[PDB]
Amino acid sequence: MLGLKTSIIGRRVIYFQEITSTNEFAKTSYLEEGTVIVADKQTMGHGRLNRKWESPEGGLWLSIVLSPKVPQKDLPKIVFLGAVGVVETLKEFSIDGRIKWPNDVLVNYKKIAGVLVEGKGDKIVLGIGLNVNNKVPNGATSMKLELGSEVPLLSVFRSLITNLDRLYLNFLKNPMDILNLVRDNMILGVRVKILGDGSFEGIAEDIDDFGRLIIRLDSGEVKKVIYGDVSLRFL
Amino acid sequence: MLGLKTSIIGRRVIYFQEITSTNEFAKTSYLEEGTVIVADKQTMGHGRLNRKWESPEGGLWLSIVLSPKVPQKDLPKIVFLGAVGVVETLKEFSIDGRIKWPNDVLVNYKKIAGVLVEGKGDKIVLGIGLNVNNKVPNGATSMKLELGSEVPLLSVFRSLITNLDRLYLNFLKNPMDILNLVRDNMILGVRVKILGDGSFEGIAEDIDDFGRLIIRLDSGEVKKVIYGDVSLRFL
Ligand SMILES: Nc1ncnc2c1ncn2[C@@H]1O[C@H](COP(=O)(O)OP(=O)(O)OP(=O)(O)O)[C@@H](O)[C@H]1O
Numbered sequence A, B: 001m002l003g004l005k006t007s008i009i010g011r012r013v014i015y016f017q018e019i020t021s022t023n024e025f026a027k028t029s030y031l032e033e034g035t036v037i038v039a040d041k042q043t044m045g046h047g048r049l050n051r052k053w054e055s056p057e058g059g060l061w062l063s064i065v066l067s068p069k070v071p072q073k074d075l076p077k078i079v080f081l082g083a084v085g086v087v088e089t090l091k092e093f094s095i096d097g098r099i100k101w102p103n104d105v106l107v108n109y110k111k112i113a114g115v116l117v118e119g120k121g122d123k124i125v126l127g128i129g130l131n132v133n134n135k136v137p138n139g140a141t142s143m144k145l146e147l148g149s150e151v152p153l154l155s156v157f158r159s160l161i162t163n164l165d166r167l168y169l170n171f172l173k174n175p176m177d178i179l180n181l182v183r184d185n186m187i188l189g190v191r192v193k194i195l196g197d198g199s200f201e202g203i204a205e206d207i208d209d210f211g212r213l214i215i216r217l218d219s220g221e222v223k224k225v226i227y228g229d230v231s232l233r234f235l
């Protein structure tokens, strides 16, 4: 009854009034590629760092089952598809979402959405949490808070699914195209701190042909940050 | 993201852009009670009397999984919950649908909805096909045709699910109530013919405590028709 017109993402949609985690359900269940898992609220959702993620009613909490048949070298770019998809949807609603490498979207440096990719073998789950009309923790923001008014959750869902489906299909054909889109919507040219095994600071210059974040340390040294267990902090 | 507030029916909804049959998927898949299977269109929909049911885009095609903890005798009345739910929804949209015993809803004698109940194992599958904005076979009708304008399909879904959830919760406690609702919304006091072997005709007087159609033949003989494979015609 939704009348979705997408090619792969959204061929099927499983909606829950409530769920522990859409990502966990997507990973565990036998589901066909393109299947979207969405819930009014998650009781046990986590972030990329495996930290607690608030998923109250009013927000958009979903996961997409994907099985891309692309080189293993491009696989780390799936997170970007999610982030760019959100940015585009936000632009449609006249909200200036900007990407914080590698998985966050911020509005005025306030977190409005987070993306989490998980995948054992051939099955890849693209998780997305977007604050729409829900209350948010300090520092974060939402579409409602930004526009000063409620936003039809379903409209945001329809918009996002449409963008993700387009970005995904093109990605299967042109895996590099996403990098340009990320580049144009990513927070760059400012100082950041990299928190991994220890830490270092520098200018976030750009992302390379592998999606790695390029940081220029004050000594002139250039480091390439591969996304995994690493945290980025703006100074 | 749908924000359904129902208690059982609609706790989970599985949507398909295309499917062979919602009832079939609902019969063969392990699904928790109250799960709703819905699709933009069915490629192999079928009816109460095994006639191919046309399910083009624009219509409301769904199946609901139930496992009513009620006495055996009551199990057969599930079809009426569907019929009445449709009638209540139609009324909300300013349409007067009347029940053609035992599973169809008509508007000015034109078929607008069909209910099909199947029970694989101990779970019951309530199938409902409602013509909203889709093209319909000659002689049939739709909410669009009745109202003269497109009808927000999701709005009809939300309304029907709300009514069915309420009707089902009461049925679990007071399984006899549904009969009264059917009586008050069914086509009675008119001549009908029961097709098949032993075919006969008479006046459709009422339905009894088992939901059997009570027919008075001209001889004065009274026959009670079970709602199984029965094929009925208005004269
Ligand atoms: N609804 C929400 N909106 C925005 N931020 C949230 C929300 N719920 C939780 N958070 C914060 O976002 C984090 C989400 O997961 P995670 O920490 O893994 O993200 P990250 O981008 O890798 O790290 P960071 O939060 O430091 O940017 C939580 O640790 C929490 O501090």
Ligand SMILES: Nc1ncnc2c1ncn2[C@@H]1O[C@H](COP(=O)(O)OP(=O)(O)OP(=O)(O)O)[C@@H](O)[C@H]1O
Binding pocket: B046, B047, B048, B049, B050, B051, B052, B053, B054, B055, B100, B104, B111, B112, B113, B114, B129, B131, B136, B137, B140, B141, B231, B232, B233
């Ligand atoms: N979407 C639809 N809207 C209206 N009528 C339909 C639709 N799809 C199929 N039909 C027709 O409606 C008929 C009625 O339902 P069914 O197939 O379950 O058996 P039936 O014996 O014809 O029932 P009835 O006595 O109520 O007409 C079908 O036989 C078919 O000709």
